[PDB]
């Protein structure tokens, strides 16, 4: 977790220079002071894994990894989630191998 603030709204800490406290009590500072140009760029051409919600670690927008975005799409078109498996295994006759007397 490393941010240690629960299901509380992030409406709080919008007027603070930090997002919460963590185990063994120290100030989790807000990581960067971004430009007004970059913020306007991210409201026209939105980031790759843009998710519209705010992260708990930092006030910055929670993005998604390429692998996760691939995994969501592969759920919605069903496309085989767990790889390294064959969809079409040969029927290994584990029971008919031995003839009945």
């Amino acid at each position: 977790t490393q941010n240690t603030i629960g299901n509380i709204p992030l409406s709080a800490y919008d007027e603070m220079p930090h997002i919460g406290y963590d185990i063994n009590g120290k100030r989790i500072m807000r990581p960067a002071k971004g430009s007004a140009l970059d913020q306007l760029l991210d409201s026209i051409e939105l980031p790759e894994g843009w998710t519209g919600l705010l992260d708990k670690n930092s006030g910055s927008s929670l993005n998604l990894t390429k692998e996760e975005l691939e995994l969501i799409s592969k759920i919605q078109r069903n496309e085989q989630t767990d790889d390294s498996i064959n969809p079409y295994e040969p029927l290994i006759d584990w029971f008919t191998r031995h003839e009945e007397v």
């Binding site: 977790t1 240690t4 629960g6 406290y21 185990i23 063994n24 009590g25």
Partner: peptide
Amino acid sequence: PNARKSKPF
């Protein structure tokens, strides 16, 4: 002392 959902103070 270090549970994952545990709060410090």
